[PDB]
Amino acid sequence: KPKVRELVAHIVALSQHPAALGTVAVTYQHIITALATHEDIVGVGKQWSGARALEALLTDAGELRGPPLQLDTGQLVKIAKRGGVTAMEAVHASRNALTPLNLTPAQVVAIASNNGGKQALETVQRLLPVLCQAHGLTPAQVVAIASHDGGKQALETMQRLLPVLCQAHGLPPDQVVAIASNIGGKQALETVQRLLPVLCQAHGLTPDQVVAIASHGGGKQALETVQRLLPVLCQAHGLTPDQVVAIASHDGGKQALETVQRLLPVLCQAHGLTPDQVVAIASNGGGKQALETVQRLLPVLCQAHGLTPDQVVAIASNGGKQALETVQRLLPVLCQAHGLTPDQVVAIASHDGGKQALETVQRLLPVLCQTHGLTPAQVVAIASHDGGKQALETVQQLLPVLCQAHGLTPDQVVAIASNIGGKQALATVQRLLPVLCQAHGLTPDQVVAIASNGGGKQALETVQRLLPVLCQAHGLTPDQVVAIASNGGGKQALETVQRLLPVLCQAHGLTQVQVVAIASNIGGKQALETVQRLLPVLCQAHGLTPAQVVAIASHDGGKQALETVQRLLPVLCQAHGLTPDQVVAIASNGGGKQALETVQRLLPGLTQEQVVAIASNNGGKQALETVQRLLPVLCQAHGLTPDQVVAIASNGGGKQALETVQRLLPVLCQAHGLTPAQVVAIASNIGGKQALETVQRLLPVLCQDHGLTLAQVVAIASNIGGKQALETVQRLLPVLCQGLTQDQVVAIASNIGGKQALETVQRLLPVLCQDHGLTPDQVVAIASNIGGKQALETVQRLLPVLCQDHGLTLDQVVAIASNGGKQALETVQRLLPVLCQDHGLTPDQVVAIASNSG
DNA sequence: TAGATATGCATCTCCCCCTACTGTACACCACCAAAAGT
DNA sequence: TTTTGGTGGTGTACAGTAGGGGGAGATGCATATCTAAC
């Protein structure tokens, strides 16, 4: 009865368990005496030495569940899976010798668990001391070379060749540890010596280039295909040195390069696919699998899902063969069944994970929506990061657990799942969460905000480990720490702070506050160290105090900025005459290095006050570049002058604003009457792209249904937050009038942050008509300042105290909530005592803050 | 040799961490001119 | 003179995009002796 398509003393289908066979160690019996899954034991009798490995396991496992054996379980299954009966024997033999002292079980399992099992093992107990002695290495690195198949060839050709490499090629030791700590270990070490110089003096390869071309599995194979194939491309494909080079610094480097020579031209010649891009799809784990797959799937994806070649490529880049493929398989099943768009889908498929998430999304989409109350969006946003499957999975297995073990909201948990690390971070969460509230004085939010950012696990950890300490003689009020552990270079920052806090005050008399504001950016370490060098250089020889260094140094990426000054600072005054104080300014917004450089390049109709300006925001680079691109094209619509476009661009969403004035200047002037002036007003603001667009898609509805005029809608849209302003105005207009008035709403909304102002009214609307009584209008009158959603909130929080505790009148408070709002409000409440208390004064002139009066 | 027995090497897929660049929204403040009380 | 408004500059978050690394596990074939049925 043939589960269909020299068995065996039962034909294969014996103890009906699964069909999950062979199973070819042609060797079989359960014989079970259980103690894990079927998937494991099967996964072990699948190997040379299967049975004998299952039985030996029995002698170490029974020799486990009585006395202190040093080990976990599936751990033991791992020793038997990859180590074989062989390694398993070398362990319940050598265990006490390792327990001395060797290593942790962490690192024993780690080196017994391969093919050189027993040898790798036996060897390490022979050469670990001689490695930490005569060469000073670590229980860490050594067991990191034995840890892969070949540890015996690995360690040995490490003791023979470590010298030749530095006695004639001088590669730092940590660099040979990076050449050996791999599968071809030996074959890397070997092919370095044989081929290290025969290129540099015939090709020009930075010695660190090939150290990192050999720091993978396939070393021998990468340089032999670099040296061999290098010209064909650099000839009639002409890639730079470092391009071919970096296509080669990965596992299975050879076939990346070989499929380039093979497929590079034939791709772009009849697939408009830049060389530069092909090179990108090559340069990744398994790239060949990409190029190969790509030639077959580019046109079918573009012609069945109408995908753009840049998306298919973007997916090819880091989702790989499995990701494109998985998107062929499931584009329809998804985009056209569970509410998805071929863009949210590509979004999911354009990360290493790839296949792995798309699938885990398919399955658990409703499971997490239907049940644990999420939306397709929030799920397709926990899915779009390298650790997709992982993060989604754990969200499912920890959401109500986190919601009940303490009380962490839902939206809040989605925020922790949605970056790389969702698992490790939600798992360092459940670990350390309480260990920091009753026992370490950090709140819930104060910590989810450590999870929620890029930092994750490594950053929550360095916090318990280093938050008590740091405040011993470094000071740093927690506020200061929780901020530091909240960026990407998290763990890196906190450490580097323990490091150079003193070398900064003990050298630059640079305050604390001054520094916690450097350890507080996505790229902490990169800056602390880079100011240590580049501080003395500047203030001394150029012109900056400490401030101007720290100011330049405090954005995600401090490093690049400083460096691009020391290099390019002078030149901008020695050729470009930008008053240095204007140059420490085109360089202290996040894209620093990049804006500096693009002034150097591009500066050469316009001025310096005017150019320092356009480049001074995050736009920086794409700011100017687009300016040149469009300044011409723009002064030719009914639009602009030179002044105008400049003002459009002196703001963060620059390039976005411009290309949205361009793509939409004459589109709604045929739907309304916008002089180009009005348009420029909507876009000479942060978030143009969103304010022009929304103005276009939402203009019809208001004017036609709600009657809102043009001017009204333009007063709305031309403040900062147009999109929010509008999309919140329309949403909530009807609801207010039915006793608010049309213009009262429009007014409250016609201020920056109108969206928020409108809301806090809709919300705290009754509380004031109902309690310490106030009329809709005095209220509207508070809510229409920029004070807004803030002066209102505080005004309820303080009606009690100022009228009762202090002695005030509802019409004086409104007249502050409506003049100086929030701060002026509290500050009054909290300054009245003083003046009356030192040497004679009265609460008569202290309200509102009457001019003078002395 | 055939093929166990035991170990070495290459390649491919996935999951994790750090750093740099870009873009949107809010809240305050302060300075200077129109617009009004008086 | 007071009362508003308008503009620009500053500080700060919050939100999105982009690629630099490494490292673990699986599978499949590649060797090196030794053992074993032929």
What do these coordinates show?
- This protein is mainly α and 854 residues long.
- The chain has one domain.
- The protein is built from 54 helices and no strands.
- α16 packs parallel to α18 and α51 runs parallel beside α53.
- The chain is globular, with a radius of gyration of 33 Å.
- The chain starts with 37 loop residues before the first helix and ends in a 17-residue tail after the last helix.
- It binds a DNA duplex (38 and 38 nucleotides) through α6, α11, α18, α20 and α24.
The span between the termini is 107 Å
- What would you report as the Rg, rounded to the nearest angstrom? 33 Å
Characterize the largest beta sheet: strand count, sense, and whether it forms a barrel: none
Helix/strand/pairing category: mainly alpha
Beta-strand residue percentage: under 5%
Q: Can you tell me the overall shape? A: globular
Subcellular location: Secreted; Host nucleus
Cryptic repeat repeats: 72-89
Core repeat repeats: 103-136, 137-170, 171-204, 205-238, 239-272, 273-306, 307-339, 340-373, 374-407, 408-441, 442-475, 476-509, 510-543, 544-577, 578-605, 606-639, 640-673, 674-707, 708-739, 740-773, 774-807, 808-840
Main location: secreted
Quick structural gist:
The protein is mainly α. The chain has one domain (about 1-854).
Topology:
Elements: H1 38-42, H2 50-61, H3 74-82, H4 84-98, H5 105-112, H6 117-127, H7 129-133, H8 139-142, H9 151-168, H10 173-180, H11 185-195, H12 197-203, H13 207-214, H14 219-236, H15 241-248, H16 254-268, H17 275-282, H18 287-302, H19 309-318, H20 320-335, H21 342-349, H22 355-371, H23 376-380, H24 388-405, H25 411-417, H26 422-432, H27 445-451, H28 457-470, H29 478-484, H30 490-500, H31 502-508, H32 513-516, H33 525-541, H34 547-553, H35 558-568, H36 571-574, H37 580-583, H38 592-602, H39 608-615, H40 620-634, H41 642-649, H42 654-662, H43 676-683, H44 688-706, H45 710-717, H46 722-737, H47 742-749, H48 754-764, H49 766-770, H50 776-782, H51 791-806, H52 810-817, H53 821-829, H54 832-837
Helix pairs in contact: 2-3, 2-4, 3-4, 4-6, 9-11, 11-14, 14-15, 14-16, 16-17, 16-18, 17-19, 18-19, 18-20, 19-20, 20-21, 20-22, 22-24, 24-26, 26-28, 28-30, 30-33, 33-35, 35-38, 38-40, 40-41, 40-42, 42-44, 44-45, 44-46, 45-47, 46-47, 46-48, 51-52, 51-53, 52-53
The protein binds a DNA duplex (38 and 38 nucleotides) through helix 6, helix 11, helix 18, helix 20 and helix 24.
